[PDB]
Symmetry: D2
Subunit: 123 residues, 4 copies
């Protein structure tokens, strides 16, 4: 339903760039570029979305992962964004995210950051 | 480094089954079967992991997504697990997860569940 | 430093009302009224804030708890807001929150909702 | 119902010490000592719990806050624990927590850590 809705270039409140293709099978594939956190250039992302969402005005559930390793840098970390795509005049992806850093057992308690990103089709 | 470490069948504290292959390129591919939450049978998952982790005793950062749609059911939801793989005698994947349900704007505030799953190679 | 900054009436993006007094000792005391989630009227809250924040332009760390029981209703739940107070022209409290419902062991996995509320001094 | 159940000394998986009194009015008051994160000695905590929980075998919802300032140190941060008290043979408090550090706007995205602590009456 939202394959075309989701496919494209999205920007969050930080100036990060999320380039995604939604597959007819529920796949999400693309690249993430973070404006913050010592990331450089594009990182692979993959994820999933609900390819057959409720017809009742509900958002479309989705998430995706970026491991912060590319040819430029390795943060030894990974972020997952869990959220929903909201169609219409000003389409949004509203997300919450978990970033886990690889740590020792002794630092495991502080391994994970949590936040929220809102993505729009205009910067 | 942990491609073989991660590839395989993992079980969490709920009796859920996570079947994953780690690609040399950082890919995670496989299937998830939840013991809870009105899921039935296998659901596609995709994700990423740090294919070149720190050599310093740190875990390996990873995450993955499941959209809760297969041929049996559609929960109109998606879970992301963010965590780290810890190698050795009793290998673990320690995760935190966000489950977002597709909702109306009026219910968006209650769209997202958070928990923690610990995966082991024995049930 | 921010005792006066924090003391007052705040509104979030949902139209909820947070009435708080910051004590010189780091205490937060007051009442919360939720615009959503079948809450009615005021609920007691308590919390803490950093009464001696960094002088470097950083926010002031704080959190507080509401148990969703008053003389009108009992949701058998509790929310904690963790965030920071940002002073200046448009003062904000930026929070992330965890709502845990009392559950059986069998439903514990779905006990906890997560979100984010941003509070302003104007509605 | 669980006033006596909750009142006491609890330990988490990190060796931290949570000393709490549950008030008949839903209050939680006491002190927290963290085994990790450069905390030293006791810090004030306050919170709330459901003083009239469901009679149906459900846990009792609660949370509390610690601002990481005492006479010894100031981390410029605050943790909230949201969870539920589970009575019986081996009483537990199962929590999820958010730690927000005071930050600049530019670092706000990385302000918040998330984890999970399980508290028992024996160390």
């Amino acid at each position: 339903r939202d394959q075309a809705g989701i496919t494209g270039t999205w920007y969050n409140q930080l100036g990060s760039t999320f380039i995604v293709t939604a597959g007819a099978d529920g796949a999400l594939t693309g690249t993430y570029e973070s404006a913050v956190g010592n990331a450089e250039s594009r990182y692979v992302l993959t994820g999933r979305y609900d390819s057959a969402p409720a017809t009742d005005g509900s958002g479309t559930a989705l998430g995706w992962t970026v491991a912060w390793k590319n040819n430029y840098r390795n943060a030894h970390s990974a972020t997952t964004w869990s959220g929903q795509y909201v169609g219409g005049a000003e389409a949004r992806i509203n997300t919450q995210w978990l970033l886990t850093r690889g740590t020792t057992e002794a630092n495991a308690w502080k391994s994970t950051l949590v936040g929220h990103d809102t993505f729009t089709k205009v910067k």
